[PDB]
């Protein structure tokens with residue numbers, strides 16, 4: 027990528043590490059693959075161990091951020107999700123979210139690191155090599171602003187997303203592949219092959235606001251947020267979507283994905299059509315009708331990012347600034363930056379260049 031900022035030399039960083047991540051070898055990996063590189067780059071660090079849910083969220087929320095030049099997060103998409111939400115929960119959120127962030131991959135669920143590795147111009151590497159590369163980026167100190175997804179649930183919960191909101195097949199596999207945690211990145215492949223054999227479809231309603239249809243006018247009364255940025259494009263979930271949105275006629279899906287970056291994983295190049303503009307995200311969905319065969323061919327084609335070449339008539343892609351997803355019947359299972367979330371309805375909008383990350 028091209029840098030829009032740079033960390034000072036020397037600099038001190040807070041390393042937030044999950045010792046349970048990377049099959050319980052994250053600390054070992056930091057010492058061998060990260061620490062010696064930081065010493066040569068004149069980067070001071072202090073390690074904080076976080077192995078409980080909301081723990082790093084609690085820390086970042088209470089932390090004196092002035093001490094640090096950057097916060098490096100070493101676990102995966104889950105922990106970066108925690109840190110960012112921790113920052114956004116703060117009363118001083120607007121300056122707090124400007125604290126540069128760094129993603130260092132540990133084990134599985136490292137799509138954000140994979141994407142940054144790609145922007146930098148590196149080959150699609152995994153595990154040891156990815157960690158080295160992501161550290162090399164941090165050592166080269168270059169910064170870039172990143173889009174942020176604001177989400178609202180049917181219970182009124184307001185959360186943020188750095189990477190993705192999945193629903194259907196993808197979200198189901200995310201959850202069910204947890205009992206294959208020890209297998210590494212390949213658990214998504216095995217989970218996919220299993221769910222493919224026992225294939226199911228998902229009834230629900232999708233609406234989105236595409237880039238070209240954002241006018242000068244905003245809905246009269248939007249969602250009133252307690253704290254944080256105002257989501258101007260969104261209306262309350264009890265209200266129907268504004269008339270300029272595209273309501274998807276189809277209501278039978280195999281998957282729906284809102285994605286802010288290039289990769290869904292270290293070996294899943296989901297978005298080869300190019301990096302999103304400021305305040306825009308990718309939106310994919312697959313309609314019921316695809317065969318098990320084609321679904322698999324798409325999944326395997328993702329490795330080298332060649333899935334869009336099939337021109338499958340059940341796969342639709344649109345760049346959007348906002349979306350609403352209302353699963354039919356009961357509550358739906360969602361993946362938010364890898365993490366499980368269950369809700370009756372979810373909607374969100376994109377906030378442009380809202381936080382900074384180290385990148386190439």
Ligand SMILES: OC[C@H]1C[C@@H](O)CCN1CCc1ccc(Nc2nc(-c3ccc(Cl)c(Cl)c3)cs2)cc1
Nearest residue numbers: 103135192196199214218296310324325361363364
């Ligand atoms: O929740 C999304 C990400 C979050 C990360 O932190 C962890 C990994 N997770 C995605 C994992 C995953 C990715 C893909 C699948 N399965 C399949 N995905 C596809 C597929 C086909 C076409 C497209 Cl355009 C896409 Cl995006 C997916 C077909 S089968 C199952 C699991």
